[PDB]
C-alpha cells in the first residue's frame, strides 16, 4: 500500500471518522459542514447523544500499541526481519515496553517512530539514487589497478572515467568482490556479469598500440569475449571523441554506440 | 405485572424472560492475555459503567 511507515501503520490502529480528529466531528455535529448539512440533526437519539457526550468530554486513549506497531512495520519494510518475525517481534517489543514503561520511554518511542519513518524514506531514495556501495567497491578496485599505461594514457583514463560514470548513472547495477577479483552485474538477478579484473588485465595491453593495427584482424583474437562484453556495456557512454578514433578499441566502441543508437531511437518511435 | 391463568392441579412457574441487552467485548493486548468487558443493561451486571 504505502511505504511511509506512519501511513502504512495508521491504517491498522484507527477507526473511521471517530473523535480522534475532534474538529471534524464538532464541525459536522453542529451545522458547519457544507457537503451535506443537516445530516446529524436527523439521526436517532441515541446516536446523537452519544456523539455529543463523546464530543464535550473526550475519552483518553493509550497510543502505545500504535507507536510500537509503527516501528515494527518500519523494520519489516526495511528488511530488518521477515514478516513472520514481524508478528513475533511486535509482541516481543510490546512486552519489553510494558515491563519498563515510563514517560521517558514514551518520549523516546515518539522520537524513534520519527527516526524510523525518516530512515525508510532515506533508504528508498538512496536505493533509487545510485547505490554508493557499488561506487565504493569500484573505487577500491581502481585503486588496486595501476594508473599508468606505458602505451597510451589519455584513452586509458578517459575509459576509466567512462566506467565510473556508467556505474554511477545506472542504479540497480552491482559492483562487488567475490573471490580475488572484482565484478560488475548490470542488475540484481540479472545476466551479463563482467569479470572486471580479468577484463582490465586483458585490456592493459591494447590501449595505445591498437590504433595502427585496427585495419588488420591479426591481433583481433587478443580480445577475450568477457572484455568484449565489458566494452559493449559502455557503448552508450564514452561518446565520440572520448576514446581516440581509428583505434581497434575506439572502432569497436563507435560501432557499438552507433548500433545501440539506431535502436532506441527507432523503438521510442514504435508504431 | 399481573398475569391471570387457568387453574392446574400441580405447581407451575411463570417464566418471564425480560429481554435485555447483553454483550461482551474481548480485549487481547499481548500474547496469551484475554480481557473481557461484560455488560447487561436492564439488569445491571458486568464491569463497565
From Swiss-Prot, chain A:
Region (Disordered): 1-19
Compartments (UniProt record): Virion; Host nucleus
Name of this chain's protein: Pre-hexon-linking protein IIIa
GO annotation, cellular component aspect: host cell nucleus; viral capsid; viral capsid, decoration
PTM description: Cleaved near the C-terminus by the viral protease during virion maturation to form the mature protein.
Keyword Nucleus: no
Induction record: Expressed in the late phase of the viral replicative cycle.
Span within the parent record: 6 to 276 of 585
General remark: All late proteins expressed from the major late promoter are produced by alternative splicing and alternative polyadenylation of the same gene giving rise to non-overlapping ORFs. A leader sequence is present in the N-terminus of all these mRNAs and is recognized by the viral shutoff protein to provide expression although conventional translation via ribosome scanning from the cap has been shut off in the host cell.
Residue positions, PTM Phosphothreonine: 269
UniProtKB keywords: Capsid decoration protein, Capsid protein, Host nucleus, Late protein, Phosphoprotein, Viral genome packaging, Viral release from host cell, Virion
Phosphoserine carried by residues: 220
Domain of life: Viruses
Protein role: Structural component of the virion that acts as a cement protein on the capsid exterior and which mediates the interactions between the hexons, including the peripentonal hexons, and reaches all the way to the penton vertices. Two hexon linking proteins IIIa, one from each facet, stabilize the unique edge interface between a pair of facets. As the virus enters the host cell, hexon linking proteins IIIa are shed concomitant with virion acidification in the endosome.
Region feature Binding to hexon-linking protein, mapped onto this chain: 133-246
Protein species of origin: Human adenovirus C serotype 5 (HAdV-5)
Family the UniProt entry places it in: Belongs to the adenoviridae hexon-linking protein IIIa family.
Region annotation (Peripentonal hexon-tethering domain) ranges: 1-101
UniProt biased composition (Polar residues): 9-19
Assembly and interaction partners: Interacts with hexon proteins; this interaction tethers the peripentonal hexons to hexons situated in the facet. Interacts with the penton protein (via N-terminus). Interacts with packaging protein 3; this interaction is required to promote correct genome packaging.
Phosphoprotein in keyword set: yes
Curated annotation (Swiss-Prot), chain B:
UniProt subcellular location: Virion; Host nucleus
PTM-bearing positions, type Phosphotyrosine: 38
Inducing stimuli: Expressed in the late phase of the viral replicative cycle.
Other comment: All late proteins expressed from the major late promoter are produced by alternative splicing and alternative polyadenylation of the same gene giving rise to non-overlapping ORFs. A leader sequence is present in the N-terminus of all these mRNAs and is recognized by the viral shutoff protein to provide expression although conventional translation via ribosome scanning from the cap has been shut off in the host cell.
Description of how the protein assembles with itself and partners: Homotrimer. Interacts with the capsid vertex protein; this interaction binds the peripentonal hexons to the neighboring penton base. Interacts with the hexon-linking protein; this interaction tethers the hexons surrounding the penton to those situated in the central plate of the facet. Interacts with the hexon-interlacing protein; this interaction lashes the hexons together. Interacts with host dyneins DYNC1LI1 and DYNC1I2; this interaction might be involved in intracellular microtubule-dependent transport of incoming viral capsid.
Family: Belongs to the adenoviridae hexon protein family.
Known role: Major capsid protein that self-associates to form 240 hexon trimers, each in the shape of a hexagon, building most of the pseudo T=25 capsid. Assembled into trimeric units with the help of the chaperone shutoff protein. Transported by pre-protein VI to the nucleus where it associates with other structural proteins to form an empty capsid. Might be involved, through its interaction with host dyneins, in the intracellular microtubule-dependent transport of incoming viral capsid to the nucleus.
Full protein name: Hexon protein
Residues of the full protein shown: 903 to 951 of 952
Amino acid at each position: 500500500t504505502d511505504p511511509a511507515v506512519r501511513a502504512a501503520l495508521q491504517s491498522q490502529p484507527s477507526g473511521l471518522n471517530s473523535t480522534d480528529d475532534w474538529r471534524q466531528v464538532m464541525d459536522r455535529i453542529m451545522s458547519l459542514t457544507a457537503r451535506n448539512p443537516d445530516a446529524f440533526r436527523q439521526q436517532p437519539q441515541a446516536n446523537r447523544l452519544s456523539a455529543i457526550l463523546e464530543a464535550v468530554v473526550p475519552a483518553r486513549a493509550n497510543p502505545t500499541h500504535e507507536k510500537v506497531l509503527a516501528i515494527v512495520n518500519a523494520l519489516a519494510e526495511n528488511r530488518a526481519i521477515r514478516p513472520d518475525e514481524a508478528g513475533l517481534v511486535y509482541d516481543a517489543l510490546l512486552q519489553r515496553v510494558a515491563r519498563y514503561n515510563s514517560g521517558n520511554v514514551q518520549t523516546n518511542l515518539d522520537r524513534l517512530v520519527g527516526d524510523v519513518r525518516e530512515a525508510v524514506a532515506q533508504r528508498e531514495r538512496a536505493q533509487q539514487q545510485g547505490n554508493l556501495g557499488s561506487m565504493v567497491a569500484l573505487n577500491a578496485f581502481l585503486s588496486t589497478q595501476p594508473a599508468n599505461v606505458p602505451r597510451g594514457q589519455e584513452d586509458y583514463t578517459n575509459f576509466v572515467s567512462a566506467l565510473r560514470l556508467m556505474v554511477t548513472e545506472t542504479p540497480q547495477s552491482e559492483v562487488y568482490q567475490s573471490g580475488p577479483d572484482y565484478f560488475f552485474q548490470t542488475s540484481r538477478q540479472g545476466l551479463q556479469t563482467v569479470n572486471l579484473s580479468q577484463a582490465f588485465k586483458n585490456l592493459q595491453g591494447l590501449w595505445g598500440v591498437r590504433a595502427p593495427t585496427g585495419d588488420r584482424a591479426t591481433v583481433s583474437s587478443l580480445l577475450t569475449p568477457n572484455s568484449r562484453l565489458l566494452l559493449l556495456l559502455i557503448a552508450p557512454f564514452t561518446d565520440s571523441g572520448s576514446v581516440s578514433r581509428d583505434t581497434y578499441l575506439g572502432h569497436l566502441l563507435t560501432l557499438y554506440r552507433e548500433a545501440i543508437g539506431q535502436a532506441h531511437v527507432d523503438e521510442h518511435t514504435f508504431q | 405485572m399481573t398475569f391471570e391463568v387457568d387453574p392446574m392441579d400441580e405447581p407451575t412457574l411463570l417464566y418471564v424472560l425480560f429481554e435485555v441487552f447483553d454483550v461482551v467485548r474481548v480485549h487481547r493486548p499481548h500474547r496469551g492475555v484475554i480481557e473481557t468487558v461484560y455488560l447487561r443493561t436492564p439488569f445491571s451486571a458486568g464491569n463497565a459503567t
